[PDB]
């Protein structure tokens, strides 16, 4: 009567950074997705290619849970075929993606007076990220023609910029915990069906 560890993913004390997003493989277990929908504490529960209600019957071979914290504004960017700073350089969702994006406000969890430095979204990248590709590099960004040489300088900028998370910040700038569930339907064991 194996049960999928959704509680570990959803109720983790600290979520990972959006640039350094955490991917957890879920397999060989029964998952009650409907229980998550019934709680309804999530501001965003958008499912693409599948219906959020009644998806128990469908059987999924490979389920991946991706966890990161972003601003309220960026939640729209976490969708297929969306363009944004977060989409281009931090987390990319494929155009043909089938799965559910779950986001809830975590203002009371991920905020500190004077700002929290942990989240650190990527601000500069040479090229747009490929879908489901993670970059953790801290190499200096050569905006200028002159080489940085590995040191901060005029026209050379650190790639990662820290989100300033404050309790007083507006809902758009407030932290949001986002879990993206990726479902694969193929000819395979389909162990994590979750009826």
């Amino acid at each position, epitope marked *: 009567t194996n049960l999928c560890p959704f509680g570990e993913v959803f109720n983790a004390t600290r979520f990972a950074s959006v640039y350094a997003w955490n991917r957890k493989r879920i397999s060989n277990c029964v998952a009650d997705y409907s229980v998550l929908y019934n709680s309804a504490s999530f501001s965003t529960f958008k499912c693409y290619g599948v219906s959020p209600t009644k998806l128990n019957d469908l059987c999924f071979t490979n389920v991946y849970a991706d966890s990161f914290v972003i601003r309220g504004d960026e939640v729209r960017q976490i969708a297929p075929g969306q363009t944004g700073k977060i989409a281009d350089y931090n987390y990319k969702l494929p155009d043909d993606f089938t799965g559910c994006v779950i986001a809830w406000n975590s203002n009371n*969890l991920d905020s500190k007076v*004077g700002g929290n430095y942990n989240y650190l979204y990527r601000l500069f990248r040479k090229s747009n990220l490929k879908p489901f590709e993670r970059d953790i590099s801290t190499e200096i960004y050569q905006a200028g023609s002159t080489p940085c040489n590995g040191v901060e300088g005029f026209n050379c900028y650190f790639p990662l910029q820290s989100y300033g998370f404050q309790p007083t910040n507006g809902v758009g700038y407030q932290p949001y915990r986002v879990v993206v569930l990726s479902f694969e339907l193929l000819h395979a064991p389909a162990t994590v069906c979750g009826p």
Partner: antibody
Amino acid sequence: EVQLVESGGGLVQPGGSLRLSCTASGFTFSNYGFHWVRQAPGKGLEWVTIISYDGITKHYADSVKDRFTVSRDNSKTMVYLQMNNLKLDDTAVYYCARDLGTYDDSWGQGVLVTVSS
Amino acid sequence: DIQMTQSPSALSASVGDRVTISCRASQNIDGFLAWYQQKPGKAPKLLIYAASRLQSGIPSRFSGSGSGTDFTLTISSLQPEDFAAYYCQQVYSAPLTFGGGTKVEFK
């Protein structure tokens, strides 16, 4: 293991100046903001000041505002609570904390500061 | 400024009893409340954060509830170790303010 140790607490005269240095170890000092809390003898807790991770932002409670200055050195991993115009009321055990009331919360043992004439 | 009122300060109970400690914020602080337990001559230990989230390494008996201006701390079963001062501190505002203090005492 995150460790905070308070030093520099000692006997002082009223109107004297004392500085308390909060040594930190086991974590990245720059990433986390720091707080100072004082418990007066036979009294409840009283938050004193905050210094942000960047260090530009500093906030002080009125009872110590314009008399206490909070500073930090990232290289030395020490937070300094400069105290000036000390008073008999100021006498307390001063605790240095990291990110109060959050998952990153940590507390030092505390150092007793005594103001006596 | 935000002001925290912690009642009942003089609460007493025997071992195994259910204890409740109520903290009231003067103005809305969302879920930004923390609960601390201070034993005599010891640094405060953070039992609860974010109003209801238990800190790691804290016993499960401690629990928190409430949002907005009203909050509560509940101990399901009292223990000898639990007989200590309890404090509620808001973290929403830039100047943090602690509560008065509640001393759970053996009956």
